């Protein structure tokens, strides 16, 4: 048997949150702020992907480039192995060559 | 486990309601019921 026998607790959502009400504000800041700031500079997150989309292999390569010197030892070993595997997969395997 | 299947029971029942009058394990077990219902249809 897989279904729950009861209804899950009703999940209320505050649509007029501070965050939800202020979402999108100060976008278009370059367009109507004399281009002093780019909207890509409003992005918060990892240092290796701010204003950058990239592939998965591209993301791994960029992370090892930008922040791979102050990474943990096991994490960096994992990143190196992932880059190796991804290189092999994206360069030797699949349809469409 | 992002978005696994929740309503599998209703699909199982969709197949099984056409097997209730069968005989054996194929009136309750989906793996055999589905084959026998396909043949019946």
């Amino acid at each position: 048997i897989g279904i729950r026998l009861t209804l899950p607790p009703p999940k209320v959502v505050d649509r007029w949150n501070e965050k939800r009400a202020m979402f999108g504000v100060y976008d278009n800041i370059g367009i109507l702020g004399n281009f002093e700031k780019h909207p890509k500079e409003l992005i918060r997150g990892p240092i290796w992907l701010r204003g950058w989309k990239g592939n998965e292999l591209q993301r791994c390569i960029r992370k090892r480039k930008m922040v791979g010197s102050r990474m943990f030892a096991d994490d960096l070993h994992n990143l190196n192995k992932r880059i190796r595997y991804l290189y092999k997969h994206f360069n030797r395997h699949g349809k469409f060559r | 486990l992002r978005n696994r299947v929740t309503d599998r029971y209703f699909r199982i029942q969709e197949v099984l309601k056409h097997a209730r009058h069968f005989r054996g394990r194929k009136n309750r077990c989906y793996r055999l019921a589905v084959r026998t219902v396909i043949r019946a249809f």
């Binding site: 279904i3 729950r4 026998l5 899950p8 | 978005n3 209703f10």
Partner: peptide, 26 residues
């Protein structure tokens, strides 16, 4: 548990229908 509400509501309706079938009111 599995996140969601539609399957739970559907199963609750099915259970209510089965209860009504088993114990029909006068």
């Amino acid at each position: 548990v599995k996140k969601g509400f539609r399957a739970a509501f559907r199963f609750q309706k099915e259970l209510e229908r089965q209860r009504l079938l088993r114990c029909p009111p006068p």
